[PDB]
Structure 1
């Protein structure tokens, strides 16, 4: 006997799936992935539902101010998104204290601008929870209600929970390999050598992006290999691989990033009013993605702003990764002269990418042809520092551009530095007595 409750209003797009609203409760019949067979209680109909739209009744996630599986940096990114003001808060699972919680509040001090402060949450005895040992609480709800009524030792009082967005709907069940007939490629987005990229529609609803491949050099059954491999590498900073069309020419169906490529975005009009901290935030998201790739020991072989895509909410993801196991200004000398290409050469690439982002999509090594570049690189030449670039960010680029491959940093260290670029290590969690 398992009863859940819906967190957002949902509409049926498939045939055997249910429809509900924010607040309606449902019985659970089957657990099998992101889709659960469930019986509604208001309609009493039995349909399939997205498992990330519901949560077990009165089990924390039911509350508006609780956010599961969110990191400290992520909570910082969300609380500064449009729709949030001073005091906009949230409670999340602790990232450094597994089995504990943390409170994140939006504040403003004049000498830095808008900020997000994080307080730890202690829990034992067990009489309840506390942030300051003087004021103790039984449940997290009453705890919230106290600090909501006057800032008892905080840099700001609590106003409203974070402006949570409705999650992206999960892919259709059993729909890995799909009939091509399900597609309506209604706009060409890009074309180049090996294939095209279209904005498409999968069955009337659900927008989608399709990459069509003109065959030849790329084989046939040598593609269900890389497909089934990259399908196992799910990540929030990598572009999601949804479906793949069986018959040749093979179609690759992925999520549709609403604002195209990063290079197009930076060169664009909106992506030029984007301040420096947001660019650093972008490169931190990319670093996070390259760090996940690094943990899995894989290589990208082609890293640049053109291969980074942007969602409508300014989220960066990584596109056709590993398609070099399936154009040199971003390439390290070890991979140019000797064809090395490792995770370290990708660190070099990330250095040039970092150069693109800061220069609003400018061409690396401007005024230089590829020969003029390669001849100068052996001469020990590195790109100068832009007039709007911090010396510390420049030092990161320089570290990425070491002659020795293994003297270069890791994407784990690069991400960490970039994530807390404006925050001293001691300032991460403000501790109040």
Structure 2
């Protein structure tokens, strides 16, 4: 509802970009003095089609109505999406550069669950839960930073019917997404399991989910990369145990990766469990 005037928005640097989105850092200086507040501004790339353009207002309305300590703060519009600047950036860019302890990773893991549990309680599915969409406020504060794929689950259904795209993050997806094209709340849990794997590997590119699943599938599979991913997943093949990752944390990852969606923990279930595991490694 807040209206930011384009003239006061002074671009500083580009922060990140997706297939049809771009996020840039701006100083909103109506004067020109030190008061100039730092804002993150998200806009639609020129190439975006009318499907992604129509679902952009819907994105803006999702973040508009989400108020949670582990969800990026919405500021207003100028359409361009004005949000808070989350100082240390994505975990994907941060972790390969800063060696963070196991205890802190488990703490970040917990906060992702609280934001995710809150999101699910508002009847929304994220569909893009990955380390790149989790922003670092400080060494003890994390936030879900992008909702480009987020969708409301229709009232009388337990899943959203997904429209098989090219920009879909298939290496973060559960088999029911890849095979039946249904996105359950339990499908975000599968992705959290992947995100936890990313945190535990410090977002190292050589150990990333696409790197690991392609070493298994092969890089010359024609139109069959998704199909071969589905069959290895249904054969019970999973990402390896991140080196130094606790055995119990791995079993919790593996349990987020149950082939049967119903056998997976909810985000609510995960919070008491991660709080305990964190407390354990905090000592």
Q: TM-score range by the shorter chain?
A: 0.7 to 0.9
Distance in 2 (alpha carbons) for counterparts of 1:366 and 1:381: 15
Q: Structure 2: which 5+ runs fail to align?
A: 153-168, 218-224
Q: Deviations over 1:269-328 (max 9, x none)?
A: x2x2x1111110110111111111122221001110011111134411002226344921
For 2:117, what is the secondary structure of its paired residue?
helix
Residue pair 1:365, 1:373 contacting (<8 A) in 2 also: no
Structure (1/2) with the larger strand percentage? 1
Distance in 1 (alpha carbons) for counterparts of 2:235 and 2:54: 45
1:386 aligns with 2:212: no
Distance in 1 (alpha carbons) for counterparts of 2:258 and 2:61: 35
- 2:271 is matched with 415
Of 137, 162, 167, which residue of structure 2 is paired with 1:311?
137
For 2:14, what is the secondary structure of its paired residue?
strand
1:227 aligns with 2:69: no
- 2:73 is matched with 240
Shift of 1:423: 4.6
- 2:221 is matched with none
Shift of 1:219: 6.7
Distance in 1 (alpha carbons) for counterparts of 2:54 and 2:176: 32
Change (3 A) 1:181 1:409: same
Cα RMSD over matched residues?
2.3
- 1:260 is matched with 89
Matching of residues 191-210 of structure 1 within 5 Å? 191-203=17-29, 204=32, 205-210=36-41
1:401 aligns with 2:257: yes
Residue pair 1:185, 1:210 contacting (<8 A) in 2 also: no
1:213 aligns with 2:35: no
Q: Deviations over 1:56-101 (max 9, x none)?
A: xxxxxxxxxxxxxxxxxxxxxxxxxxxxxxxxxxxxxxxxxxxxxx
Q: Structure 1: which 5+ runs fail to align?
A: 1-174, 425-433
Residue pair 1:365, 1:383 contacting (<8 A) in 2 also: no
Distance in 1 (alpha carbons) for counterparts of 2:8 and 2:199: 37
Residue pair 2:170, 2:178 contacting (<8 A) in 1 also: yes
Matching of residues 322-361 of structure 1 within 5 Å? 323-325=149-151, 327-361=169-203
Distance in 2 (alpha carbons) for counterparts of 1:382 and 1:189: 32
For 2:16, what is the secondary structure of its paired residue?
strand
Higher relative contact order (CA 8 A, sep 6+): 2
Change (3 A) 1:220 1:193: closer
Please identify the structure whose Cα radius of gyration is greater.
1
Shift of 1:359: 0.8
Residue pair 1:303, 1:346 contacting (<8 A) in 2 also: yes
Normalising by structure 1, we get a TM-score of: 0.52
